[PDB]
Design a protein around this ligand. Structure first.
Ligand code: SF4
Ligand code: SF4
Ligand code: SF4
Ligand code: SF4
Ligand code: SF4
Ligand code: SF4
Ligand code: SF4
Ligand code: FES
Ligand SMILES: [Ca+2]
Lengths: 145, 147, 905, 169, 571
């Protein structure tokens, strides 16, 4: 029979996407510093609209203890531990998963959270004042006191 | 910028010390009369809107605490007040007193609010109708249910 | 003075305010609007403590500790519940409008607002309403603007306007819509605008150059280093990640550059990350370029150098003391040439003789701020020695400081000081070939050719002391202005004379020495400052050697058949045609360098030297201070085939292979011992930093913070096996976090400032004996020479007045902070900031030529015709033509030379 | 596929070595207690635990006592790389001193991950070429460069869209 | 006056007794958050103070712990004697239900202390480990050799100037060590192991192999005359790792010590960190932590009882633990100020199914163990010790209570709201043999099931994390929504939470005895010192004193009867 795993199971690590389809990771490096083993490496890059994203994102899975501290430290719910354990390899170098080996085509366990809808930094499709609990920018030259 | 006084304080002489002992100050000695048809929450809301938009922006408590009191008073005037709003107004009054801010604009701003909460508290408590919430539900995360 | 904080008795300075006195004691009070270099204004209301009337008082009163003097017998409480509640309320008020931005904010992990939010214990939000938002501005290529993150602490405007003297940053608006920025989009115009990224406690002003390749502070590998972009020797903390230099932070030195850098030093580091740098030794054989490792490169170079009859070596002021000494030992003392021209060397040696034989104290950069009158002769300080210009601005504001001190106003109450001293200021007299950036605060600016500037200096010295040689032919109005200068300088208690080698005139240096001697003879506490050109110009002057013209003569006559060029492009100090001909004649050229220069096409062997980021060494300040720079990172940690050694290591192993046919990769301390044994006037460089056996209770000093991440993944794409940690045998620092960086550790070299609870640049407070003072166990660096017991004699070589001769055009040097320095102008971010090459003309000369503003003229220098567009310079004088020094094709050696065949192209 | 240093019976030999694997489970640390013959008889060594420096010689000696053909399966992050113990007393990986044929990430891995590793080892054994006899033929072992399991399983992993929320059991 | 408040314990009667005996200027009382009176003693009075505490009317009978501390980099030593190193001695009075800590300050050039083995025999291994890891010599010790590292090891790893991270691997040193293991029996000198009379032509030396460890046996025929066990083959450097991780990121390392324990191992560490942080956790956190610790205690007891003589009960426990925490063996689920997540919706059904299925298994295990006559003949009377031997060797848990001493931490010194649960502490007669220990483990299993039933019946509704600002990490929904919570989360997971400089101590009843964490903060985001006292160390040290004159098979039965794992021994 197939093995049953609870939804909270700490298996294979993925990077997820927001409901708009873009990757959730803003390359803030909180998961890498929170990793007690030090097996996450990434670089911040920025698109033309100003959206932060990981230029590369690699996890050394020969080193990972599947403790879930990176997922706990993620402020965008990008990095997630999923119910999957079949990860054996022939070469240890093939246990280094790059970004194309981690980025799934959906939101994972957090289906609706979008960090960029909360952040005040402007990107494409979200001007200043268009985030949650944000007022429109009042110009300093405006006539109202 | 002066504290509200009631009918019982109408018999006091218009001196500095006599009105200072009553919980107010003589000020410019030009008094303003408020009739029963005026809601005190709306009146204090108008006062605090004036004091908040006439801030100079130099110091933190006036610049960032008068607008919070203004938004609380707008919520209470629309009936959208939540628990902890009156306590927030009271601690804004306590922390915008003399010496806490850079100049005397903010103590004079919080004197009407303090006096109106002291006397006409029933209107301010009548403004509160909704349960307190500033956090929405995130689908995969169980909230920390504080007591 | 005695204060009682929470029932504990402390002895403080009564002239301090309570915030700085308590931060000096190790107590933690949150603060935003106060800065040690800016004073107290009481804006943010964060620093509240509870002051009691006496010991038997319990009610007390909340006071601002930054605005309260630390007078004797004061009673305060920091951990009082009312004070803690008020400080948490101030943090909450700041948090009401702050954007949800920390993951996508460059300030994260380095943010004073984050630190003070955590320090007050505020972590629960109860504000439910909207947040105000702001549009951003484009502030240029260096500073990124994000106005949402502002807490309106006014530090940026106070620094940029009141401290740095800038004019294009301000505060606009009102009640809670205060906006901090420029009146319109455009590049920030101050040369010191880059310090906004450390002055701003939030992420409003951020390092845009770092933001392109951003990494967090805990992920950096830091080292203490010295800025290589001019001669001031500001202490820096370069930090790298993934094999590339990521950022330059200010490293606090209480004696030199305390909190501030200039924009050249902060943003011109990008040449280190260039992809055309030599990363491996390359030997040219035929048309092929064979790549070698270190061993066979040393063997082949030693064989060819042993077969040659005479080998000469050409040093550079870019290279460190150890590198130039190693080249001097390899080729011999008599065959070693300083890589600078003969006139440049003459001016540099005269400046050295004035500094270490003139009997007049040369101040450190921090000490410049305490002088009462400044005369600047010929040196465009803001474009060549910028931090001296910032210190001169502080020295000028010293008069308002004195006037406020006469009214018993405290030293830290900056607003009262600026109100008392409205526009009164100490006298500043600047002299240049055109207008300077110091003219806004200068009492007088003299725009004249360098002969006339020298004549003005000689006339001032004669008017102060009649034993000085007199000047014949001074106009009466110029004589009246000279008398104004003399009355301002003679009445000053501490006059300061600043000059340097960038004017291209020996007579300007002689005139400045004469003025300083005349003021010394009158009993004044006079100081003299010399601005050199490059990071180790003074060290190369102390070491000595022949000029570049003598080396080119040796190559062209055939007496030398092998030349070793150390870190020198040779086109900035001599004509490119002559250098190319001499290097093409020589049958062996060996270039030891870290940048791809134009002489490597003639080079038979290129040794891939390390830059300052990948090397250790000693450089000598313009004031004669020996300072060590330590290696930031191992270049071979990520690319295993990189052979990028220190220049002294290359040359020492080459000398060892020349003698005993065995390579010898030595140690830095061995080379320093060789320097102090052979050159006795460089013996002070031993005490600049402790040797490689120095330990703090047995452990080394860490280069990276404790929370350095990716230890088992950063190289995992190359190989899943984690490599050996690179071993540092040269210095006391380790290439790991397994080391010490405690604020109380007994050392002077601090790679970066971090304390628990203090992740921002405010962590430097923990590393100081008093906040804004020196480092706790002394600032690093040692003065090589002391003040001479007896001074020099008066220079009697008074030059004649400038005469515009027809057909000739005297080249007036124009310096640029972005472009004149060689390596910094190779940096990509400077190319956007670099001004277009304009040839500056007088209106009368342009009318004589028929030339308008913007048309292209062609001029021939050294038989080479080059074409530039014309900019009209009203401040220039007739018969002079203005050229931008150090740009593409215009060598700084052209300053003072004449020009031929200036005509419209 | 590439190989790194008369046909039907060689395939039969590979099939016999594949379907007959006698493991020697080395205890070492907690990976074995998650999972819970002489080394002369065993042909598979399953190292599952932290490689301490004081018993790296024990591992090396018990590996040298085994007889060819021999295969090594390393279970868990400690045996793969040292895991969370980058520390003075721990060898950073089993493959520092003995060659490893299959690696399993985890801390500890599940027992069915050990079954999956056995399946992978069976495929690797079935697609390898070894000398038939010690007197006739080439005396070289040709390991086959298998396609990595993450390149093979990339499509079905990246195709994952939604997962169950962690609020349930 | 909270339970985490800094106290000097000057009102403790032992302080007055020491003051009346030695004088007021003979010791320095340090105010800590350990909950224990800490007194700094001169080195020349250490044996006098120890022998005085041995002879009190309610005497201090057990040396709970003894270790060292490198004080050179510690910058917050206000009210402390001048020390480069220090040695601490944690002593417990069971009759007084109290404990005291004695601290001896040592200068770096004179790192020797008088031995404590004449007063307390477990000081032998404790002082050997202190010499091995800190370089502190104990004068008068019989065999002061290394116990964690090999004998040919350079330096002392717990010193601050010793590098923590793994050095470069050397195949040559591995081949040399394998050569030494090849010729170890050939050149076995019976003096580098503390033995004597090595080869009466009848003494034979044996090397042997719940974890793997080697014990050297001296045999007269079939009888054991002397034995020394060689430990340290499972040394992971967990304390050195404690100095290299932040307070938050060290929690998985707490899990991996005593890998049968899981949350039981997490509990004393997070309780000591919360003492340092000034955190009082709410009641729901207490009940969640108690429930998970009792589930893991049941799992460990089932494994001990089964391996003494099985799988389905442990599978159900691991299924419930995997549902709650996401992982079976090493949950890493306790947090500073709470737990990682709330309980998943549906945990009631799983716990109810587990509790409605376990009493039948309880009856089965009682029939299989207590009523088995062959087991009652095989396990009774072999390697039995009384209360005097249990006290002097630091024996805790089932052995100590099998000697009749009613000392359980959950009742004597209650923690995590254990005083709100109704349960019994089983004690035995005066004899602690194998059968009495197995009986006590079965009765403890029944009482843990009672505790789980009470956890299920009234589970409090409320927060799973404390309201404190030092709760690490903050609640996740407020982190994703609120900026000040985001700031707190950002700084806590990256630089680390800042614990103010203090010392804290928490002792708990683990699955095999008393497990304790002693934490020293120097005001930073990492621990200055993390000392882990584990029961298996003291239980392994007692073995040579209980099999003098027994057989090798009796040694095997004794090893099976003592609940210990080697990761707990070596940490
Ligand atoms: S699960 Fe733990 S070990 Fe694995 S990458 Fe995340 S933080 Fe690191
Ligand atoms: S913590 Fe999350 S958003 Fe930040 S770098 Fe890691 S995966 Fe990306
Ligand atoms: S209280 Fe006064 S100084 Fe402060 S912001 Fe308001 S108006 Fe300005
Ligand atoms: S300025 Fe500081 S508090 Fe604000 S978003 Fe950036 S890191 Fe966070
Ligand atoms: S931009 Fe920065 S420095 Fe200027 S007021 Fe705002 S927070 Fe302060
Ligand atoms: S003044 Fe000179 S030394 Fe200082 S930062 Fe600028 S270029 Fe560097
Ligand atoms: S990988 Fe994890 S479970 Fe396995 S031995 Fe190492 S610490 Fe134990
Ligand atoms: S630091 Fe004192 S009010 Fe800002
Ligand atoms: Ca070096």
């Amino acid at each position: 029979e197939p093995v049953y795993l609870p939804p909270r199971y700490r298996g294979r690590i993925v990077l997820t996407r927001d409901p708009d389809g873009e990757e959730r990771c803003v390359a803030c490096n909180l998961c890498a510093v929170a990793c007690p083993v030090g097996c996450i490496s990434l670089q911040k890059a920025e698109t033309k609209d100003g959206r932060w994203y990981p230029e590369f994102f690699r996890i050394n899975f020969s080193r990972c203890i599947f403790c879930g501290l990176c997922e706990e430290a993620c402020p965008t719910t990008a990095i997630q531990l999923t119910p999957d354990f079949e990860m054996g390899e022939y070469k240890r170098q093939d246990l280094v998963y790059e970004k194309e080996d981690l980025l799934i085509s959906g939101p994972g366990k957090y289906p609706e959270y979008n960090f960029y809808r909360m952040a005040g930094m402007a990107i494409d499709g979200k001007d200043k004042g268009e985030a949650e609990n944000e007022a429109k920018p009042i110009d300093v030259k405006s006539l109202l006191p | 910028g002066t504290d509200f006084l009631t009918e019982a304080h109408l018999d006091l002489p218009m001196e500095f010390e006599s009105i200072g002992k009553a919980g107010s100050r003589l000020g410019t000695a030009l008094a303003m009369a408020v009739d029963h048809e005026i809601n005190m929450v709306s009146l204090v809301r108008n006062l605090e809107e004036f004091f908040a938009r006439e801030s100079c922006g130099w110091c933190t408590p006036c610049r960032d605490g008068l607008p919070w009191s203004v938004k609380i008073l707008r919520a209470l005037e629309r009936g959208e007040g939540q628990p902890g709003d009156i306590e927030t107004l009271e601690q804004l009054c306590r922390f915008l007193g003399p010496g806490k801010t850079f100049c005397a604009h903010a103590p004079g701003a919080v004197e009407p609010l303090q006096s109106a909460i002291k006397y006409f508290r029933e209107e301010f408590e009548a403004g509160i109708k909704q349960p307190f919430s500033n956090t929405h539900l995130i689908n995969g995360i169980q909230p920390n249910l504080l007591k | 003075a005695t204060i009682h904080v929470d029932g504990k008795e402390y002895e403080v300075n009564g002239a301090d305010n309570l915030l700085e006195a308590c931060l000096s004691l190790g107590l933690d009070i949150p603060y935003f609007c106060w800065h040690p270099a800016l004073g107290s204004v009481g804006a943010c209301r964060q620093c509240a403590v509870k002051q009691y009337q006496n010991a038997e008082d319990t009610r007390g009163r909340l006071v601002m500790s930054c605005m309260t003097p630390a007078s004797d017998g004061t009673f305060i409480s920091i951990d009082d519940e009312e004070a803690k509640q008020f400080r948490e309320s101030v943090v909450e008020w700041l948090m009401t409008n702050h954007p949800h931005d920390c993951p996508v904010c460059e300030e994260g992990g380095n943010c004073h607002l984050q630190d003070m939010t955590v320090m007050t214990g505020h972590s629960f939000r109860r504000y439910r309403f909207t947040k105000r938002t702001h549009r951003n501005q484009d502030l240029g290529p260096f500073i990124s603007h994000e106005m949402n993150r502002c807490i309106a602490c006014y530090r940026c405007v106070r620094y940029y306007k009141d401290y740095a003297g800038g004019t294009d940053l301000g505060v606009y608006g009102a009640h809670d819509n205060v906006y901090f920025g420029r009146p319109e989009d455009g590049t920030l115009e101050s040369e010191f605008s880059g310090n906004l990224v450390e002055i701003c406690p939030t992420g409003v002003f951020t390092d845009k150059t770092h933001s392109e390749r951003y990494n967090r502070k805990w992920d950096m590998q830091f080292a203490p280093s010295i800025c290589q972009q001019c001669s001031i020797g500001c202490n820096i903390s370069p930090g790298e990640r993934y094999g590339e230099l990521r950022r330059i932070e200010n490293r606090y030195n209480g004696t030199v550059n305390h909190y501030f850098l200039c924009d050249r030093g902060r943003f011109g580091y990008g040449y280190v990350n260039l992809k055309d740098r030599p990363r491996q030794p390359v030997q040219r054989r035929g048309d092929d370029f064979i790549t070698l490792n270190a061993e066979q490169a040393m063997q082949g170079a030693a064989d060819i150098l042993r077969q040659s009859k005479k080998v000469i070596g050409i040093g550079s002021p870019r290279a460190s003391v150890e590198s130039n000494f190693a080249l001097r030992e390899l080729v011999g003392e008599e065959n070693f040439y300083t890589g600078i021209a003969h006139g440049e060397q003459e001016r540099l040696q005269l400046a050295l003789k004035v500094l270490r034989e003139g009997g007049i104290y040369t101040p450190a950069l921090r000490e410049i701020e305490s002088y009462d009158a400044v005369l600047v002769l010929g040196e465009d300080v803001t474009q060549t020695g910028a931090r001296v210009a910032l210190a001169v601005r502080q020295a000028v504001k010293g008069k308002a400081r004195e006037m406020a001190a006469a009214q018993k106003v405290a030293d830290w109450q900056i607003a009262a000081i600026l109100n008392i001293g409205q526009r009164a200021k100490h006298p500043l007299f600047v002299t240049n070939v055109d207008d300077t950036r110091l003219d806004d605060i200068a009492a007088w600016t003299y725009r004249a050719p360098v002969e006339d500037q020298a004549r003005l200096g000689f006339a001032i010295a004669h008017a102060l002391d009649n034993s000085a040689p007199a000047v014949d032919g001074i106009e009466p109005e110029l004589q009246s202005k000279i008398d104004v200068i003399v009355q301002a300088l003679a009445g000053a208690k501490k006059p300061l004379i600043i000059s340097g080698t960038n004017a291209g005139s020996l007579e300007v240096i002689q005139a400045a020495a004469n003025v300083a001697k005349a003021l010394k003879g009158r009993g004044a506490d006079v100081g003299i400052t010399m601005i050199a050109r490059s990071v180790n110009s003074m060290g190369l002057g102390i070491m000595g050697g022949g000029s570049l013209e003598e080396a080119l003569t040796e190559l062209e006559t055939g007496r030398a058949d092998a030349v070793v060029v150390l870190e020198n492009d040779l086109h900035r100090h001599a004509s490119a045609t002559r250098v190319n001909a001499a290097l093409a004649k020589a049958p062996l050229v060996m270039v030891v360098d870290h940048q791809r220069t134009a002489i490597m096409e003639n080079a038979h062997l290129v040794l891939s030297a390390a830059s300052f980021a990948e090397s250790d060494g000693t450089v000598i300040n313009n004031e004669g201070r020996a300072q060590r720079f330590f290696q930031v990172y191992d270049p071979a940690y990520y690319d295993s085939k990189t052979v990028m050694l220190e220049s002294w290591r290359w040359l020492h192993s080459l000398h060892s292979t020349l003698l005993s046919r065995e390579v010898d990769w030595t140690q830095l301390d061995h080379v320093i011992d060789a320097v102090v044994a052979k050159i006795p006037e460089l013996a002070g460089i031993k005490d600049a930093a402790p040797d490689a056996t120095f330990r703090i209770r047995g452990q080394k000093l860490a280069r990276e913070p404790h929370r350095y991440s990716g230890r088992t993944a950063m190289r995992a794409n190359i190989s899943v096996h984690e490599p050996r940690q690179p071993q540092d045998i040269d210095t006391m620092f380790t290439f790991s976090m397994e080391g010490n960086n405690q604020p109380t550790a007994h050392r002077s070299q601090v790679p970066f400032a971090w304390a628990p609870g203090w992740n921002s640049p405010q962590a430097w407070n923990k590393f100081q004996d008093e906040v804004g003072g020196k480092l706790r166990f002394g600032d690093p660096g040692v003065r090589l020479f002391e003040t001479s017991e007896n001074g020099l004699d008066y220079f009697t070589s008074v030059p004649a007045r400038f005469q515009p001769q027809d057909g000739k055009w005297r080249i007036a040097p124009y310096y640029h902070l972005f472009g004149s320095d060689e390596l910094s102008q190779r940096a990509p971010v400077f190319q956007s900031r670099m001004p277009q090459p304009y040839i500056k003309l007088n209106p009368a000369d342009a009318a004589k030529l028929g030339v308008n503003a913007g048309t292209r003229v062609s001029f021939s220098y050294d038989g080479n015709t080059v074409t530039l567009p014309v900019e009209i310079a009203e401040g220039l004088t007739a018969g002079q033509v203005g050229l931008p020094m150090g740009m593409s094709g215009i060598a700084p050696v052209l300053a003072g030379a004449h020009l031929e065949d200036l005509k419209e192209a | 596929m590439d190989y790194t240093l008369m046909g039907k019976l060689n395939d039969m030999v590979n099939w016999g070595r594949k379907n007959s694997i006698w493991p020697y489970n080395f205890g070492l640390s907690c990976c074995y207690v998650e999972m819970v013959a002489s080394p002369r008889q065993a042909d598979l060594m399953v190292v599952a635990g932290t490689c301490f420096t004081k018993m790296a010689p024990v591992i090396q000696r018990l590996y040298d006592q085994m007889l060819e053909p021999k295969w090594v399966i390393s279970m868990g992050a400690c045996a793969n790389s040292g895991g969370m113990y980058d520390i003075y007393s721990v060898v950073q990986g089993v493959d520092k001193f003995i060659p490893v044929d299959v690696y399993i990430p985890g801390c500890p891995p599940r027992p069915e991950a050990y079954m999956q590793a056995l399946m992978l080892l069976q495929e690797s054994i079935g697609k390898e070429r070894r000398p038939l006899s010690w007197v006739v033929g080439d005396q070289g072992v040709y390991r086959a460069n298998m396609q990595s399991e993450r390149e093979r399983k990339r499509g079905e992993r990246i195709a994952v869209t939604n997962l169950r929320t962690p609020d349930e059991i | 006056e909270p339970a985490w408040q800094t106290r000097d314990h000057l009102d403790d009667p032992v302080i007055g007794e020491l003051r009346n005996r030695f004088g007021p200027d003979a010791f320095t009382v340090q105010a800590t958050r350990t909950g224990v009176p800490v007194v700094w003693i001169k080195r020349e009075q250490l044996l006098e103070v120890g022998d005085f505490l041995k002879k009190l009317p309610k005497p201090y009978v057990m040396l709970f712990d003894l270790h060292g501390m490198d004080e050179r980099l510690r910058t917050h030593r206000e009210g402390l004697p001048a020390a480069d190193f220090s040695v601490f001695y944690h002593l417990i009075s069971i009759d007084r239900n109290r404990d005291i800590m004695l601290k001896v300050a040592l200068a770096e050039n004179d790192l020797h202390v008088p031995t404590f083995t004449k007063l307390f025999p477990n000081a032998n291994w404790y002082e050997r480990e202190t010499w091995d890891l800190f370089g502190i010599t104990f004068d008068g010790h019989p065999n002061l050799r290394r116990i964690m590292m090999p004998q040919t090891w350079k330096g002392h790893p717990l010193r601050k100037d010793y590098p923590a991270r793994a050095t470069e691997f050397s195949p040559f040193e591995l081949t040399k060590a394998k050569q030494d293991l090849e010729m170890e029996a050939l050149t076995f000198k019976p003096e580098e192991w503390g033995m004597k009379r090595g080869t009466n032509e009848d003494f034979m030396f044996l090397n042997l192999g719940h974890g793997a460890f080697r014990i050297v046996l001296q045999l007269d025929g079939e009888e054991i005359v002397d034995c020394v066990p060689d430990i340290g083959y499972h040394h992971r450097g967990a304390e050195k790792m404690g100095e290299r991780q932040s307070w938050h990121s060290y929690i998985p390392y707490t899990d991996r010590i005593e890998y049968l324990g899981g949350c039981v191992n997490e509990m004393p560490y997070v309780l000591a960190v919360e003492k340092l942080a000034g955190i009082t956790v709410p009641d729901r956190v207490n009940v969640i932590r108690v429930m998970l610790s009792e589930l893991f205690r049941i799992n460990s007891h089932l494994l001990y009882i089964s391996t003494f003589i099985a799988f389905t009960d442990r599978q159900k426990i691991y299924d419930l633990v995997e549902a709650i925490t996401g992982f079976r063996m090493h949950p890493a689920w306790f947090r500073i100020g709470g737990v990682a997540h709330d309980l998943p919706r549906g945990w009631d059904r799983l716990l109810r199914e587990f509790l409605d299925w376990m009493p039948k298994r309880l009856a089965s295990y009682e029939k299989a163990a207590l009523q088995n006559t062959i087991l009652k003949g095989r396990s009774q009377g072999v390697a039995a010790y009384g209360a005097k031997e249990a006290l002097e060797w630091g024996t805790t848990g089932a052995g100590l209570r099998a000697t009749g001493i009613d000392f359980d931490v959950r009742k004597a010194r209650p923690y995590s709201g254990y005083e709100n649960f109704d349960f019994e502490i089983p004690v035995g007669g005066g004899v602690s043999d194998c059968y009495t220990r197995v009986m006590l483990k079965v009765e403890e299993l029944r009482q843990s099931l009672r505790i789980l039933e009470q956890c299920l019946n009234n589970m409090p509704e409320g927060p799973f994390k404390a309201d404190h600002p030092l709760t690490t990490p903050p609640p996740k929904e407020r982190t994703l929504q609120h900026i000040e919570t985001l700031i707190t989360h950002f700084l806590q997971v990256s630089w680390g939470p800042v614990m103010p400089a203090n010392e804290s101590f928490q002792m708990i009843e683990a699955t095999k005895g008393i497990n304790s964490y002693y934490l020293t903060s120097d005001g930073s985001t990492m621990s200055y010192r993390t000392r882990i006292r584990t029961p298996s160390y003291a239980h392994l040290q007692q073995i040579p004193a209980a099999i003098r004159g027994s057989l090798v098979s009796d040694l095997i039965v004794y090893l099976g009867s003592i609940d210990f794992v080697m990761s707990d021994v070596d940490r």
